[PDB]
Homo-oligomer: A and B are copies of this chain.
Amino acid sequence: GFKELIKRDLTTEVGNADLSKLVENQIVGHCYRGAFAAVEENVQEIS
């Protein structure tokens, strides 16, 4: 009942530096993923 969708893992890219202010490139990471879960598989315990 549990499935992991991985279109793309972590991917870091750098850009959008503003030379007019001497600010360095915006370092940005992104990820494409999805998780499918269910209550049909679980029982929740106490202690």
Contacts and interface: CB of A to CB of B under 8 A. Distances in A.
Number of this chain's copies in the complex? 2
Interface residues of A, number: 12
A44 B14 CA distance: 53
A15 B26 contact: no
A20 interface: yes
Interface in A8-40: 13-20, 22, 26, 28, 30
A14 B26 CA distance: 17
Nearest to A25: B19
A30 B14 CA distance: 22
A15 B15 CA distance: 10
Contacts of A18: 15-16
